[PDB]
Amino acid sequence: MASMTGGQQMGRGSNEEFRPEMLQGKKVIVTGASKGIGREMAYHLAKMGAHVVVTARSKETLQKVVSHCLELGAASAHYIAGTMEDMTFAEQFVAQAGKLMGGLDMLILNHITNTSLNLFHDDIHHVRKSMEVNFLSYVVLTVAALPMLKQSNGSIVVVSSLAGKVAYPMVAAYSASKFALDGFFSSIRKEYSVSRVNVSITLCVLGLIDTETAMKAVSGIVHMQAAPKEECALEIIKGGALRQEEVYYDSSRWTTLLIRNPCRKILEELYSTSYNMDRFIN
Amino acid sequence: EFRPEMLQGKKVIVTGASKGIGREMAYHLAKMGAHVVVTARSKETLQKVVSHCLELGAASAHYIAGTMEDMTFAEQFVAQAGKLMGGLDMLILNHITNTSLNLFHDDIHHVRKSMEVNFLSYVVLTVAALPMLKQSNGSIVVVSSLAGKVAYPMVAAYSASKFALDGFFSSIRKEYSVSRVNVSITLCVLGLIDTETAMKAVSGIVHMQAAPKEECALEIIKGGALRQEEVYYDSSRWTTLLIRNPCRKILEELYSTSYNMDRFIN
Ligand SMILES: NC(=O)c1ccc[n+]([C@@H]2O[C@H](COP(=O)([O-])OP(=O)(O)OC[C@H]3O[C@@H](n4cnc5c(N)ncnc54)[C@H](OP(=O)(O)O)[C@@H]3O)[C@@H](O)[C@H]2O)c1
Ligand SMILES: NC(=O)c1ccc[n+]([C@@H]2O[C@H](COP(=O)([O-])OP(=O)(O)OC[C@H]3O[C@@H](n4cnc5c(N)ncnc54)[C@H](OP(=O)(O)O)[C@@H]3O)[C@@H](O)[C@H]2O)c1
Ligand SMILES: O[C@]12CC[C@](c3nnc4c(Oc5ccccc5F)cccn43)(CC1)C2
Ligand SMILES: O[C@]12CC[C@](c3nnc4c(Oc5ccccc5F)cccn43)(CC1)C2
């Protein structure tokens, strides 16, 4: 029947009223998907009927996610276990994931290195690992994924934090890695716009989320209201499906009222006339 | 209100000081009568800067040549600079890895080198300098860019490294405030500057007015001396009207009522 079927989900209003059917049959990669928000995203995509490839270091926990994804109604579900500290693994994982699904529509970059709250003193090893895992691997994954994403006019979804937009104590190395994601991905988004690379980039700015690891890490130090992981995961997916540049998800209504930087948007528009990129794209 | 006398007899480190803005900062400090230790890879060009600093009126001037790609050099450089001067009042972090304008395709080696040189070495230099800066109630001056506050095409890796500096240094500034570490942190947000390397790199690509390097260097020094959190220096008056993020300042204040750090500092 699929051979005799054709058409498009993305008509009038698909910019921007989300429908779960926008993900039906989509080929999606989810990193850091054995637990937390990543696992919740895998589950939502499964229910939507997407093809899913999940990653994390633990094959046993990834197996459980895959099995549950198949139960939920995933078109297909696979896992490839490995560390995002290993740039060769990051690069080969994408080729292997694309081969399993026959392409790629959405790349969800969610994994981070294990981090606890502490004052910065002399842990350079954690600053470097944070930059390698939380930032550099996202770039390596993007490079490996781009040819397939260009072919499908796909999407890159980057999971960040409010600590990737404002300063927050006790998470300096982590904040540095999240700010780096904004600088990198927002700059290449301008490059893609002028180069006519029809690959959307969604930066997801999340507040505190009720994941097991975050609740343990912040216990007794951060007393703010945590937001539910299930709804968080859905808002990330929605943002990527609607090709939104930025997603904001937090418990506080004051955050939503204040995080947006209209001055940055205006400045970027003003500076867009300061350059002549003709030699780079012809 | 700044006075050149605020730098008289001050012990100052200037990185990336053999050329451009860094060299201009060394010269201003020399005229102000500061003790100066300059760094970059080229000993021959550093020798010229030191010699000119002494002519301009520096209380003392030294150089130590090396690469900021080498974290051990970054760490040992601070100890030696401090040994030469008998302490440290101001740490000016200015050096960057050589960068040209290009679309990002697959140059992961440049993204990593940018992060290592432009960001990681600044952190290593700060760790090595902190005990001396705590002793003098000193200052850390971080040289960034408008590309470290807003997105700009052709400088993705560079922009990522400048954004990282904001996240890192602005977070430790909050930590220092609660830890009662009396070391100021000045983030300098610069627009296009008429340095020889920038003018060559942007030739035919970027046509916006470049601001003078001499005045840029002075504004950086002023900001550090006044212990300002952020310095904004650009040719355009519309930049000055728009770069500031008062909402970020408000949000940071609103979120500080949500955490308790008195378990890490007592
Ligand atoms: N939770 C919050 O309050 C909060 C707030 C703001 C932003 N965020 C963002 O939300 C995203 C997900 O966070 P979360 O709280 O859901 O995290 P999480 O539950 O702790 O899960 C992190 C995931 O990454 C994997 N991972 C860890 N180290 C890895 C490595 N070296 N290589 C590959 N995968 C690795 C973990 O599995 P394995 O250990 O088996 O590898 C796991 O699947 C992150 O980008 C985080 O910054 C979360
Ligand atoms: N110029 C602009 O338009 C502009 C705009 C915004 C912000 N800024 C910021 O201003 C600062 C200074 O820029 P500039 O234009 O003055 O640059 P510059 O003239 O090109 O000088 C860069 C300096 O860093 C040194 N350096 C390069 N690679 C190094 C390495 N591996 N290890 C140690 N030192 C190294 C160079 O010396 P050696 O090669 O001999 O080592 C030189 O002294 C930078 O932080 C830059 O981001 C500049
Ligand atoms: O793996 C983890 C290590 C840190 C982590 C984490 N990710 N983002 C954050 C954060 O951002 C915030 C910044 C400003 C206001 C509210 C926030 F929420 C504040 C505190 C912890 N945050 C919690 C557990 C991610
Ligand atoms: O060493 C160099 C490599 C890039 C370099 C450089 N440093 N900052 C920038 C920049 O920021 C800007 C961002 C937005 C508006 C105006 C700007 F100015 C725009 C273009 C080049 N920029 C020019 C030569 C630094």
Side-chain angles (χ1 to χ4, degrees), chain A residues 271, chain B residues 96 99 101 145-147 150 152 155 158 191-192 198 201-202 208:
Chain A
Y271 304 140
Chain B
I96 55 161
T99 139
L101 311 210
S145 165
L146 280 176
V150 309
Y152 200 87
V155 295
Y158 171 87
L192 186 66
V202 313
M208 74 199 316

Side-chain angles (χ1 to χ4, degrees), chain A residues 267-268 271 274, chain B residues 96-101 144-155 158 162 190-193 195 197-202 206 208-209 234 239:
Chain A
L267 272 179
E268 288 179 12
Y271 304 140
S274 69
Chain B
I96 55 161
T97 198
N98 288 0
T99 139
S100 61
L101 311 210
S144 184
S145 165
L146 280 176
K149 285 297 192 176
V150 309
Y152 200 87
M154 305 158 159
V155 295
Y158 171 87
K162 298 302 204 180
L190 320 175
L192 186 66
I193 313 302
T195 68
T197 64
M199 297 306 95
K200 269 185 258 251
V202 313
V206 348
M208 74 199 316
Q209 35 182 224
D234 184 68
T239 293

Side-chain angles (χ1 to χ4, degrees), chain B residues 106-135:
Chain B
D106 63 1
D107 198 352
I108 193 70
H109 299 283
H110 175 65
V111 185
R112 179 172 286 100
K113 192 175 269 181
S114 287
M115 291 308 319
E116 284 288 322
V117 179
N118 314 350
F119 166 68
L120 213 67
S121 73
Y122 280 40
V123 181
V124 172
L125 294 155
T126 294
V127 173
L130 204 68
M132 283 188 291
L133 296 174
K134 276 168 168 162
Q135 181 84 248

Side-chain angles (χ1 to χ4, degrees), chain A residues 31-39 41 55-59 61-62 82-85 89 109-114 133-134 138 159-163 174 178 181 204-215 218 226 229 232 236:
Chain A
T31 76
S34 61
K35 50 190 204 177
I37 303 151
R39 178 175 58 187
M41 288 188 287
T55 194
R57 293 167 300 175
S58 178
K59 72 174 162 79
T61 64
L62 286 165
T83 182
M84 290 296 179
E85 292 164 275
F89 167 76
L109 304 171
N110 169 263
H111 67 93
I112 52 165
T113 197
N114 287 359
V133 178
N134 314 351
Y138 281 40
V159 186
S160 186
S161 165
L162 281 172
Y174 170 88
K178 298 300 202 181
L181 290 172
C204 308
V205 180
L206 317 176
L208 185 69
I209 318 296
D210 70 1
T211 68
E212 188 153 349
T213 63
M215 297 306 93
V218 309
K229 56 182 181 181
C232 179
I236 292 164

Side-chain angles (χ1 to χ4, degrees), chain A residues 195-206:
Chain A
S195 296
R196 297 178 179 182
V197 170
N198 310 297
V199 178
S200 64
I201 296 165
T202 305
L203 185 71
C204 308
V205 180
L206 317 176

